[PDB]
Amino acid sequence: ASMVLSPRDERTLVRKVQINPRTTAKDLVKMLEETGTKVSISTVKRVLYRHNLKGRSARKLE
After folding, report:
1. Which one of 6, 39, 55, 59 is least enclosed by Cβ atoms within 10 Å?
2. 3-class state of residue 56 by DSSP
3. What's the rounded Cα separation, in Å, for the pair 46 and 37?
4. What is the signed CA dihedral for 12, 14, 18, 22, rounded to 10 degrees?
5. What angle do CA 62, 15, 18 make, to 5 degrees?
């Protein structure tokens, strides 16, 4: 996870979910199969809860 294990998919996911609060699990599964990387739903579902608890950001006021 933290290291950026899958350098296209994890890197894209952490940028998009924090920048666009619109982005949901249905978007994420569609991108993962489009890339062709097998990723479990449960890790996607848990990282969404983690980013709901903390969004780490270097944009706008902060």
Report:
1. 59
2. coil
3. 18
4. 60
5. 55
CA 6 distance to own-chain centroid: 11
Contact 44, 25 (CB under 8 A): yes
Q: How far is CA 51 from CA 1, 41, 60, in A?
A: 13, 16, 18
Total Cβ atoms within 10 A of residue 22: 8
Give the determination technique: NMR
Q: Any idea where the domains of the chain sit in the sequence?
A: 1-56
The residue to which tokens 């903390």 are assigned: 54
**Burial classification of residue 23, based on how many CB atoms lie within 10 Å of its CB (0-12 exposed, 13-18 middle, 19 or more buried):** middle
AA letter at 10: E
